[PDB]
Amino acid sequence: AQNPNCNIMIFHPTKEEFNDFDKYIAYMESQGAHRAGLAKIIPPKEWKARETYDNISEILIATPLQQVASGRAGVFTQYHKKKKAMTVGEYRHLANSKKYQTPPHQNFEDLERKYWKNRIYNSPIYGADISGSLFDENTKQWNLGHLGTIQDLLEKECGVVIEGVNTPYLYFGMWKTTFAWHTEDMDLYSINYLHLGEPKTWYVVPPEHGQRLERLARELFPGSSRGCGAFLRHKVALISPTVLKENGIPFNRITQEAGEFMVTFPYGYHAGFNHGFNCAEAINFATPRWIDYGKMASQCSCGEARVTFSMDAFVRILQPERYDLWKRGQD
Ligand SMILES: O=C(O)CNC(=O)C(=O)O
Ligand SMILES: [Mg+2]
Ligand code: NI
Ligand SMILES: [Zn+2]
């Protein structure tokens, strides 16, 4: 078995190997990359996402989210308070202000220490989940707006044509902006490109150990667990590496820098934080290997998770027994 310790693997495809996206994902899996839940892909030196980032300041962040924490430094939830709209140029200025800027630090490890010590005491503002793309239309390789759609994959594998669309999302971050422990909708893959700015630190649990994370989460968030049998789908809970290590949960960590892709694999729980002002683009995708994960994915039916239009068909076709309850939670 390749990669039996479930380490995060880093890949350096050549420009030739960068042509065929599906083929390269399958290659990474042949080397055991999925066992970690997360892989890094460093693009060939010849490649670029677009020519420059000099003209992005007028993008609108319609609903910036202030991420307010509750709990203790290593075990907390966050809620999202909606703020007034602002442009990316306004948000960048805000991120660089004395109130929100990255503190002085020695290295990524020191900054990580500072994040876990101090995150709860601040409420950073995240420009998340903005439909759109920063890939140039002329970028032919690993262009996250030109991937094969999940609806097409389901149709190719299973023969059933379904409604729905699959488009990318932009994320504008600042110091301490946080993504809570989650797997993707329907335990899909994700791919994330860090277009510009400061790094993003990731934590990940191997898919084969995801249920160990879930059991810890039920212990640590006992009211939330009574409320919902899949409350990590709410995407609000944080658990620090120190707490994970104290509880014997297998995990790994890695820091993504600008110009790098990360791929999350089906049922790979992940969480993390931004180092400072940045912009990422991410999208879900599927492969043939995903189908069995989609059929087994948990679902929130309590009403909290509320998701896209396109998840309906995935539930309806892959999980017909669950469909009626889940749809009630959507309505
Ligand atoms: O970058 C973020 O805030 C969150 N991204 C992801 O969870 C992802 O790409 O799957
Ligand atoms: Mg602009
Ligand atoms: Ni994710
Ligand atoms: Zn729920």
Swiss-Prot record:
Record keyword Metal-binding present: yes
Residues that bind 2-oxoglutarate: Y126, N192, K200, K235
Family statement: Belongs to the JHDM3 histone demethylase family.
Maturation and modification: Ubiquitinated via 'Lys-63'-linked ubiquitin chains. Deubiquitinated by USP14 with the help of TRIM14 leading to stabilization.
Binding-site residues, Fe cation: H182, E184, H270
Free-text function comment from the UniProt entry: Histone demethylase that specifically demethylates 'Lys-9' of histone H3, thereby playing a central role in histone code. Does not demethylate histone H3 'Lys-4', H3 'Lys-27', H3 'Lys-36' nor H4 'Lys-20'. Demethylates both di- and trimethylated H3 'Lys-9' residue, while it has no activity on monomethylated residues. Demethylation of Lys residue generates formaldehyde and succinate.
Organism: Homo sapiens
Signal peptide stretch: none
Keywords from the named record: ADP-ribosylation, Chromatin regulator, Dioxygenase, Iron, Metal-binding, Nucleus, Oxidoreductase, Transcription, Transcription regulation, Ubl conjugation, Zinc
Protein name: Lysine-specific demethylase 4D
Modified residues (PolyADP-ribosyl glutamic acid): E16, E17
Binding site for Zn(2+): C228, H234, C300, C302
Record has Iron as a keyword: yes
Localisation per UniProt entry: Nucleus
GO terms under cellular component: blood microparticle; chromatin; nucleoplasm; nucleus; pericentric heterochromatin; site of double-strand break
Free-text comment on the cofactor: Binds 1 Fe(2+) ion per subunit.
Portion held of the full protein: 11 to 341 of 523
Entry cofactors: Fe(2+)
GO biological-process terms attached to the record: cellular response to ionizing radiation; chromatin remodeling; double-strand break repair via homologous recombination; inflammatory response; positive regulation of chromatin binding; positive regulation of double-strand break repair via nonhomologous end joining; regulation of gene expression; regulation of protein phosphorylation
GO molecular function, one term: damaged DNA binding
Known catalytic reactions: N(6),N(6),N(6)-trimethyl-L-lysyl(9)-[histone H3] + 2 2-oxoglutarate + 2 O2 = N(6)-methyl-L-lysyl(9)-[histone H3] + 2 formaldehyde + 2 succinate + 2 CO2
Enzyme kind, highest EC tier: oxidoreductase
EC number per UniProt: 1.14.11.66
Domain of life: Eukaryota
